[PDB]
Amino acid sequence: DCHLSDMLQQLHSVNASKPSERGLVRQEEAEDPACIPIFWVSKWVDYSDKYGLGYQLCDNSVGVLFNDSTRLILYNDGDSLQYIERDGTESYLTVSSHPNSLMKKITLLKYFRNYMSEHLLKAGANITRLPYLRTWFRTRSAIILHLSNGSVQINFFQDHTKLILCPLMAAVTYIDEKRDFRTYRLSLLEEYGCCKELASRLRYARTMVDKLLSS
């Protein structure tokens, strides 16, 4: 299930602790720079009506999850392609070899790429195995992006705040409206507590994860 069940248990545990009602709250003590993620989605474009969901990762790789449930990834060299078939099977190719098979999907990818480069800003830009987008969906309040490495990223439209959950290290990275970035160990938030804002979004995340699991 790509670590979602493990993520749900982590989120329930911290939310069950009611971290915003400790009294003596010390969020900073829950920080850990060893849990900082390597990968997250830095840009995205939703054209699901026609083609699919295009996105850029923080390494500047680009990808598309097409509506036929296939996925094409362009590495940051601008030429190397990874193609993920419906059945999970993966193959590697190049743009320069001009393959008849994927010419249309490559062309589409470049259109996504060009849009993001011209019109979108890169999230997480202020800081330092390539996963692909397994699935995504959006609510009125956010878009939920589940990567093949188990990470779940949640972008809230209203305030441009973001969550990146990593179940492997039982950690959450929180990006606030000031574009400020902090990574926390979930078990420690349980102990030292946190602000109402972070707590509310972890509750929202629990629910979004259940949705992913319900599909």
Residue numbers at the binding site for ligand 8Z5 (CB under 6 A): 45, 47, 51, 108, 111-112, 115
User: Residue 105 or 134: which CB sits closer to ligand 8Z5?
Assistant: 105
Do residues 50 and 59 lie in contact, with contact meaning Cβ atoms separated by under 8 Å? Answer: no
User: Residue 111 or 156: which CB sits closer to ligand 8Z5?
Assistant: 111
3 state SS of 41: strand
State the SS3 of 102-163.
CHHHHHHHHHHHHHHHHHCCCCCCCCCCCCCEEEEEECCCEEEEEECCCCEEEEECCCCCEE
Do residues 204 and 142 lie in contact, with contact meaning Cβ atoms separated by under 8 Å? Answer: yes
User: Residue 111 or 137: which CB sits closer to ligand 8Z5?
Assistant: 111
Do residues 152 and 202 lie in contact, with contact meaning Cβ atoms separated by under 8 Å? Answer: no
Shortest distance in whole angstroms from residue 45 CB to ligand 8Z5: 5
Shortest distance in whole angstroms from residue 67 CB to ligand 8Z5: 12
Residue 70 per-residue DSSP state? -
Give the residue among 69, 10, 18 at the shortest CA–CA distance from 192.
18
| DSSP-assigned letters across all residues of 73-88 | EE-TTSSEEEEE-TTS
Shortest distance in whole angstroms from residue 111 CB to ligand 8Z5: 4
Shortest distance in whole angstroms from residue 113 CB to ligand 8Z5: 9
Shortest distance in whole angstroms from residue 142 CB to ligand 8Z5: 21
User: Residue 55 or 112: which CB sits closer to ligand 8Z5?
Assistant: 112
Which position's Cβ is nearest ligand 8Z5? 111
User: Residue 108 or 205: which CB sits closer to ligand 8Z5?
Assistant: 108
Shortest distance in whole angstroms from residue 207 CB to ligand 8Z5: 30
The count of C-alpha atoms lying within 13 angstroms of the C-alpha of 122, restricted to the half-sphere facing its C-beta, is 17
User: Residue 45 or 209: which CB sits closer to ligand 8Z5?
Assistant: 45
